[PDB]
Amino acid sequence: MKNISNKRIIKDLKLLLEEVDANNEASPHSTAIFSVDTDTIYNWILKVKAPADSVYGGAGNTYQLSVLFSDDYPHEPPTVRFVTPVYSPLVTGEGGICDRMVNDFWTPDQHASDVIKLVLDRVFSQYKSRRDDDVNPEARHYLEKFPQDFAARVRRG
Template identity: 25%
Template sequence: MSTSARRRLLRDFRRLQNDPPSGITGAPLDSNIMVWQAVIFGPDETAWEGGTFKLTLEFSEDYPNKAPSVRFLTKMFHPNIYNDGQICLDILQNQWSPIYDISAILTSIQSLLCDPNPSSPANSEASRLFSENRREYNRRVREIVEQSWVDES
């Protein structure tokens, strides 16, 4: 294993423990620093409020020069999240920079929940409802939030 990737992940983990962003937790899964599980709590006063959304982050030896693979384990209904949980987010693709740490990644994903980009749809139905029928979109999001309470995936 690359010692620089490992060192960076340990530093990210300490930073996340000492100064966690609001509504976000994350830690390596088991004893493998290269695979993390995180939880994003739905931000207050949004359709996502009260939700508990689990994600995995998989890091390569090239981290932080290469973005991790991030996906939701919790079922999601969102314009920028594919049915398999993969996330369409610029900083995880073409806008990645080594300055991003795990806190920045998770904070960006949390922000994306409430502020989707319908012009880059990963889920065309969610994108259409978000643009054309916000009430129905919010109803579907609330269903996902309620499912997140019982999903132990």
């Protein structure tokens, strides 16, 4: 890895910042990103609310994420990681997600914003529909057989 100008990381950060400041003036189904700090242009730390809609946006808790880029962006998209623990079939105890979640659908055309919205929605809102991106099968089994007890458990931690 090297700390190098990337035309598209910078262009996509400027675009996210513009959207995050348009959002924080006005959906219960969408997740709101409300802070974007960086640590090198290659590492974006975000603060997020899940949708009021979901199990995960109940007490309006904050969720912290890391978006990590490589020198090859936009050819490969960044990795999203939860810094906040999240009980989920799609997230590990490390905060990892399967690369497939993002990589099956990536074209270099798309923006860091699009990647971030896809992941937040997938995990907070579209989790019930299983694909090839399950990383925590104890959480999947538990949702599948105790839908209601899985909810009470998300509000715990």
